[PDB]
């Protein structure tokens, strides 16, 4: 409990520190954006006298709350997001715990099924993600066996061989699972280099805010399944990298505790 | 460690589970979605009838403009900042816990860069805390189980845990947020499993004046509830390994 309460203080400090950085980075721009939206609404009310401010506000709120409740207030649709295609990809967000929220159960029966789907689906997916990580580790172990043979003849210390290997695993993994897919996302979704990198990190870390979702704007036939294949291998890579950071914090804490 | 033959077999199982799940989700949601998409069109048509000075393309531009502004971080309602220290502290929590509701998300270029670095070191930092909380909860349960003294103990851990971490908080959420019994249970599961869709977020309605102790008590429940759900999901994962080993022999 002494270590637990010490780690809890560290996390609270980290949360207050992060909360201050986020406020300073976002609040001035948010106040600027909230002024221009008010100006646009005021100019709309001037251009449409037959619409009162409370009627406009009711309409805007009604559209936002309907969109949040599962029904899109755009178009007529005689574009369903509950067809087998989008339903298969929604089921993926549940078992991967990414949960963007762009598609979510609105029916009472759908909410009951989603509870049971995560209960058995999340541990079922965890077994697959462990196997994908072992397959990626075996593929990296086969590639590293040729690199370590060159370093062995160059008299590099056995402990440093593992140090160079961990940096290579992180660098090569960041290329095929982070940069290469984000370049594709920039050229397809029309997102900036930063927004594409931000999407990759948020997706593969299972945070899934839902502000950026691949294949959402009203795409190629091969696009959606290739994105979800990248999710499967990318989650296993990010799990290994986040485990290395978690292990480095334990080694850093043990060295600091002794000194 | 795991052979490719077992990995490819487990991959087929997951694809079957995803296609099966998708079929259940389509049958449960598509008829209601078609019903909801008809009433939204009727509402828009009746609005255009009540406000002749607004053309359908102007109404559609306005609705799209409001949805895209809301999605970009700026709420088109009112004239209530969601980036104040209070809401920003709770947003930072959704990042390290990987829940990520998405109700609040970085809009500035600097905020997106900081959020990438915040998750990279914050997620493993939180994982160390969540492991310690799980050990403290296991030690508290081990002390209570010693007084009662394995099958009965596992059922007792699951049942008592479901009372204090799932039912008791959901009852409070129903009496505070105005959510139904099912919507409150759905919220608890989605939150404590780090899925975090964002459709239901505690302390989100502007109209209701929430208590001072409400928001931090929800985030304290998240801390202990995540550690409990990790233990339960690990038991289900272990159950599947024991079930697969028994079926492999037979």
């Amino acid at each position: 409990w002494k270590t637990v309460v010490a780690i809890f203080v560290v996390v609270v400090v980290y949360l207050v520190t992060g909360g201050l950085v986020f406020r300073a980075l976002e609040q001035p721009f948010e106040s600027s954006q909230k002024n221009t939206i008010a100006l646009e609404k005021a100019e709309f009310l001037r251009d449409h006298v037959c619409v009162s401010p409370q009627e406009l506000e009711t309409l805007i709120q009604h559209a936002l709350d309907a969109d949040n409740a599962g029904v899109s207030p755009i178009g007529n649709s005689s574009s369903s997001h509950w067809d087998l295609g989008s339903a298969f990809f929604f089921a993926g967000t549940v078992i991967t715990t990414i949960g963007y929220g762009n598609i979510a159960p609105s029916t009472e029966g759908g909410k009951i099924f989603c509870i049971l789907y995560a209960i058995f689906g999340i541990p079922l997916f965890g077994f697959l993600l462990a196997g994908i990580g072992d397959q990626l580790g075996t593929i990296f172990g086969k590639s590293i066996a040729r690199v370590e043979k060159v370093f062995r003849k160059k008299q590099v210390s056995q402990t440093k061989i593992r140090v160079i290997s961990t940096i290579l695993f992180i660098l090569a993994g960041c290329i095929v699972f982070v940069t290469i897919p984000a370049v594709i996302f920039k050229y397809i979704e029309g997102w900036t280099a930063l927004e594409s990198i931000y999407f990759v990190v948020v997706t593969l870390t299972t945070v899934g805010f839902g502000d950026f979702v691949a294949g959402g704007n009203a795409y190629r036939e091969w696009y959606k399944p290739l994105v979800w294949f990248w999710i499967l291998v990318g989650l296993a890579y990010f799990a290994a990298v986040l485990s290395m950071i978690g292990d480095w914090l334990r080694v850093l804490s043990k060295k600091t505790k002794e000194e | 460690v795991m052979k490719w033959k077992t990995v490819v077999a487990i991959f087929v199982v997951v694809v079957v589970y995803l296609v099966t799940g998708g079929l259940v989700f389509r049958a449960l949601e598509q008829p209601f979605e078609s019903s909801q998409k008809n009433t939204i069109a009727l509402e828009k048509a009746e609005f255009l009838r009540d406000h002749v000075c607004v053309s359908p393309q102007e109404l559609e531009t306005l609705i799209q403009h409001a949805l895209d502004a809301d999605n970009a971080g700026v709420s088109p309602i009112g004239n209530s900042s969601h980036w104040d220290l209070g809401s920003a502290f709770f947003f930072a929590g959704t990042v390290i816990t990987t829940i990520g509701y998405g109700n609040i998300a970085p809009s500035t270029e600097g905020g997106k860069i900081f959020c990438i670095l915040y998750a990279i070191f914050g997620i493993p930092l939180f994982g160390f805390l969540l492991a310690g909380i799980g050990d403290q909860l296991g030690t508290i349960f081990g002390k209570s189980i010693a007084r009662v003294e394995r099958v009965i103990s596992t059922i007792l851990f699951i049942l008592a845990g479901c009372i204090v971490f799932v039912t008791i908080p959901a009852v409070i959420f129903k009496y505070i947020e105005g959510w139904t019994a099912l919507e409150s249970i759905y919220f608890v599961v989605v939150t404590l499993t780090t899925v975090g869709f964002g459709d239901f977020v505690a302390g989100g309605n502007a109209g209701i004046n929430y208590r001072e102790w409400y928001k931090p008590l929800v985030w304290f429940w998240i801390l202990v509830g995540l550690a409990y759900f990790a233990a339960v999901l690990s038991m289900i994962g272990d159950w599947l390994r024991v079930l697969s080993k028994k079926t492999k022999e037979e």
Partner: nanobody, 112 residues
């Protein structure tokens, strides 16, 4: 000073395509919603098309499937690709910053 410069209008044949452009300046173009309007001689101002900050497009029912609005944030220019022009499209086209009161000069497009 918000300035909207229009181009690409003029006399055209019915059925033939035409492209209007709008060089914008004096404001943050990336986050603003652009729109195109048309003033018919015997009619009032009519919204033709509108592209939001997230590149989502909204069109008038009369121009649906024929006209296409697109934005080039890199060059701060909003376009209106008018295809399969009918004599009913003969009107003065104005470039607008939707719900901000900023209008262009107006380019006469005549289809006959």
């Amino acid at each position: 000073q918000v300035q909207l410069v229009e181009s690409g209008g003029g006399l055209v044949q019915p059925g033939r395509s035409l492209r209007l452009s709008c060089a914008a300046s004096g404001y943050i173009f990336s986050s603003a919603t652009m729109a195109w309007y048309r003033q018919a001689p015997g009619k009032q101002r009519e919204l033709v098309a509108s592209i939001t900050r997230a590149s989502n497009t909204v069109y008038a029912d009369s121009v649906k499937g024929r006209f296409t609005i697109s934005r080039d944030n890199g060059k701060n220019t909003v376009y209106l690709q008018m295809n399969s022009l009918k004599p009913e499209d003969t009107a003065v086209y104005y470039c607008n910053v939707w719900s901000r009161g900023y209008w262009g000069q107006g380019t006469q497009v005549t289809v006959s």
